[PDB]
Design a protein around this nucleic acid. Structure first.
Length: 206
RNA sequence: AAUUUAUGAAUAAGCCCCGGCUAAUUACGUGCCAGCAGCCGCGGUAAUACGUAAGGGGCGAGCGUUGUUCGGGAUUAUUGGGCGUAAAGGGUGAGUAGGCGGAUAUAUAAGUCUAUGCAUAAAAUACCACAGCUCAACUGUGGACCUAUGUUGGAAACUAUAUGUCUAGAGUCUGAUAGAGGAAGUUAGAAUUUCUGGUGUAAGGGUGGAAUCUGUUGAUAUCAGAAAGAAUACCGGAGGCGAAGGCGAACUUCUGGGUCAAGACUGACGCUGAGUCACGAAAGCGUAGGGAGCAAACAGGAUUAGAUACCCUGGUAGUCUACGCUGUAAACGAUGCACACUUGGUGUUAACUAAAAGUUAGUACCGAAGCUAACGUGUUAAGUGUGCCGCCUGGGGAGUAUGCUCGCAAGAGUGAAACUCAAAGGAAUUGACGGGGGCCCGCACAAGCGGUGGAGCAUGUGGUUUAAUUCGAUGAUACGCGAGGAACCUUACCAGGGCUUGACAUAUAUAGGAUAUAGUUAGAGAUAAUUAUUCCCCGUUUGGGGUCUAUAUACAGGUGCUGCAUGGUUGUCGUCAGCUCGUGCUGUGAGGUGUUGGGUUAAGUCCCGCAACGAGCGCAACCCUUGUUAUCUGUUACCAGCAUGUAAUGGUGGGGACUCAGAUAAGACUGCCGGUGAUAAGUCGGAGGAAGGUGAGGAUGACGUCAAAUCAUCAUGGCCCUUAUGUCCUGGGCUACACACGUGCUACAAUGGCCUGUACAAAGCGAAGCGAAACAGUGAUGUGAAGCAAAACGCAUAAAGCAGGUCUCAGUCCGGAUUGAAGUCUGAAACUCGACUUCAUGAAGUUGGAAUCGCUAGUAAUCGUAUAUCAGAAUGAUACGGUGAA
């Protein structure tokens, strides 16, 4: 079980936490857990609609005001109908917490300069019986031509539904995991299928 | 037969197959059972291969199976295969029959060719047209294609027949010449053994190490003499000769073969060769000798569980000679013989030439083209051609059984079948492995310091038994592990009691509060009945917006099975230095090169060269602590020079000096110097410097392996339960024992125990939490509350240490397990099953067998401190400092 999480390696060196706030010992655990609740509720309510979101990141300037930023590459679809889905989030969140939630949508400029988006795309494709090798080759080529300096993709599980599990990997360019000053984006995604569950991991060097 | 009307879709399809061969896939049931199958092979919980359905393919009044023949099989190869290593060259030669064979002239015309003359090859059938059955099959009339024999007339090259000619093939003669060629008869010396005679004494001999054996009856060693047997160092080899086997001291006699040439003669007299004959290493057999040394069988001594062996000491056949048999070898160049041809390089033998220099005939190595499955071969073909002989047709059974021939015998030659397998085999590639080789690394060894295994307890597992002692982890990589806390909860187990839209959700329509706060009734509690009480709030209320009751559902639920259906995470080889790709090149191919060379490093680190050129994941670097300095800031920190509070406290007023804290920077990069090294990479010292060659530590763990661990953290396919395997509570249990193993603690005592006084830390923790000063108490602790969300106060006066007194080698003033009595704290509760204290009780234990673990410097070793889980409870785990080596 090798290969430490690259994000964890790069935190505080050239990355930052996915939640911007600080609080003392008294409030820390409660506010932490309300952040966890926000993510799990948003993602439940959206992956009901199957939506693939790059990240959910939180900014808490105030002990009772909170800013939730959903960052995604299909912002209009994520918004839904005139922000009614936006408020469908907000009302449900206040139905369990006593703070003021302001939701904003961060638009993704380069959909294939985002490892999480790539991983979600792969997972959705293999969820519809698309052939894994062709999907991986196509995605690799597309994102490699768009301008990334290095990309690696690894899927694992019951590929093509055989009895015996297997893992398949593709890569090219520079993917220097051990380099700390590297700007490595890491994404993980996961496909539920009639034959079991298939894991997808994506490394992308910039 | 055929023809014309009358009635009407009326009278009418099945079989095999669907993994590849082989045209045709999905869904259920089965779970290495049932079964399929021509071959390979399918079925162990998701079967396109089994069984049934749905589809699809093939053929069709047929479709499949079995039996038999041919074809695919060039797998009996005339067309059209082989024999170095896959099955296959005879052990070798001389030759009979047979086959084949230089140049050229004439004749014959058997072969061959032609007029596809001429006939004969009955008919049908077989081939090509044309016809008649409604067509076809079927039937009929003509026309031929081969090739088989006979015969007529021609052609003559080739084979054949008969008679000649020639010389270039092959022989004879002449001359020259090399040689362990063979047989017979003589001779020689070294060495060894035995015997005899001197000198001389206690060992000799032998092995990895010993012993048997030899020797005080004179060994071994040494000198002299005598005798016998066998074998021929040096010459002596990338030699020589012979058909092969084989042949090496010297000489003679007898005798076989080869090579060269103008150097004449014969004139095809030749090649190969079934039977047959001759020879044929070593072993063996018969007769008669000989017997030194060596040495099957055999004996003894060792190694070993055993040693009918390897090793040692002895030792009979045999080894030797004469004659007569046997006729077998990895008898090999694993390559039959002969001839005509087909680039070279480097040696060597003989001859011709005075010799070089070349040629010829041999004999070796390398190698172009060609050949070869590859290895390799390559003018001494395994190359291009042919003559003749021998031999092969999957493996086992089997070179067996039986028969025959030969032999004194042992055996040799010839040589099956039944049955059984789907492979056997050749060469080569990539890995792995070696009690193979070479070069390196690691507390791997070595050199050291402490342990484990022995004892007391703590802790885990197995075994064992209970109503249950829930499970998972099981070599390294499980076993003080998941467990960073089993008195209840935890908790998955057990004995009991309740609940069934459920202990909890979301959404569908009812109809008025939820549970609420505090108690009652029974209860072990859960529970139900209850009492206080309501549809509340936004609106000025009804209608409304949502809210739970309490109902009916969609639904929930599961620590139940499968880690061999999985994701995710993790161990491990291993922080070992390796693992691959793009293009190019190379091999028929699996692949190889890059990444095989010489140096060098901790490293596929770096340099050069090399059909490789480059790149990627790794290594290193970038990161975080610690190690020096500079600026910025001095509270809650710090205190130097001041005053000063009697303390204890920088405590107070004061002060930025210092430490310190934390931001920003500098600094160490083989940078520089010397030597060495291929002008290199690198390497050993030196200077500067807090830090030098990665400064020290941590983080960082490549492709992959072990179907390695986990469904029991979560997620998850399939299966399974649905008043149940779910769920609420009471108690028990995970803490059970004749036992075996693993991890730790405390000791066994004098580098120590006990008593008294005194000194020096760091890192952490505190909100229902830290809890001080003091007092009570021998003590665990109790009352109290200062201060503090804390570099502000508290935990907290650290312990080894040091300065004194005591103990005297004693199971002890060592050891503190075990039990008895009385207490402390936690919480509702600690009997099974908590920690701690006081008093008594004082066991095992004398440094621990085989075996085994950790560690290269602030490291082992030892002494305390803090934290995580936590109401309470650590010898475990995490972290911190003190002393500090070999």
């Amino acid at each position: 079980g090798q290969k430490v999480h690259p994000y964890s390696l790069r935190v505080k060196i050239n990355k930052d936490w996915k939640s911007k706030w600080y609080f003392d010992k008294k409030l820390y655990s409660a506010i932490l857990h309300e952040d966890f609740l926000i993510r799990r509720e948003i993602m439940k309510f959206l992956k009901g609609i199957k939506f693939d979101i790059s990240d959910i990141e939180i900014i808490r300037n105030n002990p009772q005001k909170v800013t939730v930023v959903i960052v995604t590459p299909r912002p209009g679809s994520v918004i839904g109908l005139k922000g009614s889905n936006l408020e469908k989030i907000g009302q449900l969140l206040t139905k369990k917490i006593s703070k003021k939630i302001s939701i904003k949508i961060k638009e993704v400029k380069r959909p294939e300069l985002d490892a999480q988006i790539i991983a979600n795309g792969i997972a959705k494709q293999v969820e519809n019986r698309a052939s894994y090798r062709k999907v991986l080759k196509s995605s690799l080529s597309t994102s490699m031509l768009k301008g990334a300096q290095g990309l690696k993709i690894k899927i694992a599980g019951r590929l093509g539904g055989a009895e015996i599990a297997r893992s398949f990997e593709v890569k090219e360019g520079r993917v220097p995991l051990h380099t700390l000053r590297a700007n490595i984006d890491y994404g993980f995604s996961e496909a539920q299928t009639t034959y079991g569950i298939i894991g997808v991991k994506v490394w992308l060097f910039k």
